Paper text:
NV1 TerS crystallized in a large monoclinic unit cell with five nonamers in the AU that diffracted weakly to 3.95 Å resolution. NV1 and PaP3 TerSs are virtually identical (RMSD ∼ 1.1), as expected for two proteins that are ∼65% identical in amino acid sequence. Peak 1 and peak 2 had a roughly equal quantity of protein for PaP3 and LUZ24, whereas most of NV1 TerS eluted in peak 2. The same intramolecular plasticity observed in PaP3 likely exists in the TerSs from NV1 and LUZ24. SEC-SAXS of PaP3 and NV1 TerS revealed a radius of gyration (Rg) of 41.44 ± 0.40 Å and 41.33 ± 0.43 Å, respectively,, which is larger than the calculated crystal structure Rg values of 33.84 Å and 33.32 Å, respectively. The distance distribution function P(r) calculated from SAXS data indicates a maximum diameter Dmax ∼131 Å for both PaP3 and NV1 TerS, also about 25% larger than the maximum width of the crystal structure (∼105 Å). Similarly, the NV1 TerS crystal structure docked into the 9-fold electron SAXS density revealed modest agreement between solution and crystal structure (χ2 = 2.55), despite the exceptional quality of this SAXS density. In both cases, the solution structure of TerS had a wider outer diameter than the crystal structure and showed extra density for the missing C-terminal tail. In contrast, using 10- or 8-fold rotational symmetry did not significantly improve the FSC resolution, supporting the notion PaP3 and NV1 TerSs exist in solution as nonamers.
The genome packaging motor of tailed bacteriophages and herpesviruses is a powerful nanomachine built by several copies of a large (TerL) and a small (TerS) terminase subunit. In contrast, TerS is a DNA recognition subunit that binds packaging initiation sites (referred to as pac or cos) in preparation for genome packaging. TerS also stimulates the ATPase activity of TerL, while repressing the large terminase nuclease activity. Thus, three related small terminase subunits from Pseudomonas phages PaP3, NV1 and LUZ24 are polymorphic in solution but adopt a nonameric quaternary structure in the high affinity heparin-binding conformation.
Numbering used by the authors:
A (entry chain H), D (entry chain B): 23 to 125
B (entry chain I): 19 to 125
C (entry chain A), E (entry chain C), F (entry chain D), H (entry chain F): 20 to 125
G (entry chain E): 22 to 125
I (entry chain G): 21 to 125
């Protein structure tokens, strides 16, 4: 279970099937076949690992959007859009909508 | 120096402030050496609380941006489109929106 | 001195200086425990702080309504902005969108 | 209940709690508590009154859109957008949309 | 010659001169007492005011329809405007877009 | 000479000239008393007048189809505009959008 | 009658004139002002179906146009990107989930 | 050489040359009758025409996939283009949209 | 080999937008290369779609790196950084908010 996690991290970081698979610690001579089955047997974990890796970088972008909202030297529209986004994360959304349908 | 939940709160703050996972790990109070493993498990076992803390911090910093949008809505020397978008945003925050749209259903 | 008003001042201080510690030390407590004691007030009263910020935005809303009306009636700005302002004010008046037909299959 | 509506219009025009409060006829010293409680207890009607005040300019917006739609010296895109808006108000909408489920 | 004509004239005056007090003075009453009864009379006929505004914009819609057709057929404007006008008029004709599929979960 | 074709001419004149009084005087009746009975006449024949206006608006669709096809076939047109025209005609041809899945909570 | 209706619809689509289309419908030129309104309104559904088929028959041309604009290296990258997006949307790769949460 | 082979070749020729009479003569039929037989021939086999055009659109999908991937991997492009390419390729990759809360009123 | 060459054929169609060269290089019956391919496409359209989907999806980490780095580059236009941050937060799980509905039957 540790080799598959390391393979997922290496594939997520260096975008290569054969290079990451040979970097896992396995046989070099057959690096085109066994790798498709190994990827086919752990698709759920690969998706989960890539999703959590993408999600773990959120604080840096949150800091970036907050800083652009408070930096006076950037265009005002960008600050307005950043403030709108962060306030929308705070929890204030849109309002009423009515539907008519009886046939 | 102890109470690992306080160290976890410091870890969350360090991850929120610095653009390096290794620096955050060294700032938590753990062993710096061999920084290739033993870090993924610590990062993965408390992801839910990390997300909750990030959400609470963003919501607590939202009022500063609300003040910013209000002040830009109150700036007379700024472009009209920016003022219009700010006014739309704050009025939508007050709770007054758009109206109906009709749907017809067929067998 | 009455309670719930000090919470209103605390909410305003947090809204103004984008920092929890400065608002907490300025409200009514001591320095020795300024990282924890503030967490119970913030986590147990999140609903009231959100309500206070929303009510302040709503109380400043009439100024923005006046602003959008004046921009809609000021000819010194680009025509698109006036058109968008007129559309928004008419949508606020109570005139919405039109028909949409749906057919469902299996 | 005319005084509350007058208070709402005065607050809408002079954008200040203290100035509107003193224009109501009240005490200068109590500008942080009692006015917040009265506003919190009559927010629904205050909001309705400000909405009707903004809505009373709807004929002005109709005049603005009609006059802007008929100017030949203005850029074509705005004339098109005005025509689209007025036609959407006229009562002509979009067309059919189908739903397919394949669970 | 009835208060229905005074109400229609009042609505038209508000539409053509964007002011409540002057419109009320144009209704036929004393100008000085324009702050008290006009708000109640204005609020008691909000539905009719909205209906009149809607009917007026719908009756002036054909001029805008002619304008949008002419801009769709006017060669001196940039192509994007002609395309958007043609798309709008064709969508009005009754030829629209197609399906979107839905997946439901438990 | 019957109310159906006279009403059709009334609708066509209203569609062409953008004037209520001109259309009514073209109908064939007395010009002066055009302010009172006209509200009842419009209220009693609004549905067919609106249907006629919609039919006239929809009948110009072949012109818009020709315009969108020619703009899609002009190499001197902006690439985005040609792409949008091709998208519009293909979406009318019968190729639409795709899946949308929902996750539900009790 | 269905072929005269087809020619009438095509003439209306191409020669932008109601009088020309009606006279092309094979009828008398002089009395071309009255019968034409009933004739046009009595077959609106078939006219719409034929015109829809006419607009759809040029769809392969739009396919060729979008492919050619997507394959031109001298075009801005955004236009090629949007053309690829559109062609993929027909290819069978679409958007993803949207969740609804209710509070009641 | 089969009649379905002549018809699919006709569909491909219509897709390539964009002329009905030329496409009809390219189908394998008589040139002198290019106005009559062509309307019924196109109307009676619309389903297969739609299937053929859909297959032609689907067979070029790898080129568009390569284009979007290279645009996401092209360093000389403006930031908006790279961002849109990356977002689109991830949308196909399988990471969904945001969350939405719904409020209902009786 | 019945099925690994078929996977190679799927990849060849995904990469080089052609049919005759890929079909002759796969190892199949050349004399009937216009028909046999229609039968294989009709019998394996779902598998072809799955393979092309995997081909497009497997490059996702490169684009994720691109969007993350654009969010962290100070020399890029502000709108681009804002949109990148919006996308990364949308993946984190914070989107737009509530909508209220009123029904009249």
């Amino acid at each position: 279970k540790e080799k598959l996690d390391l393979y997922c991290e290496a594939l997520c970081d260096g975008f290569n099937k054969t290079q990451a698979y040979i970097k896992a610690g396995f046989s070099a001579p057959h690096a085109q076949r066994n790798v498709a089955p190994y990827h086919r047997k752990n698709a759920e974990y690969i998706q989960a690992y890539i999703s959590e890796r993408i999600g773990s970088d959120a604080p840096a972008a949150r800091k970036v959007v907050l800083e652009i909202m408070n930096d006076p030297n950037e265009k005002g529209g960008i600050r307005l859009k950043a403030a709108q986004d962060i306030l929308d994360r705070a929890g204030f959304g849109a309002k009423q909508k009515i539907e008519l349908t009886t046939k």
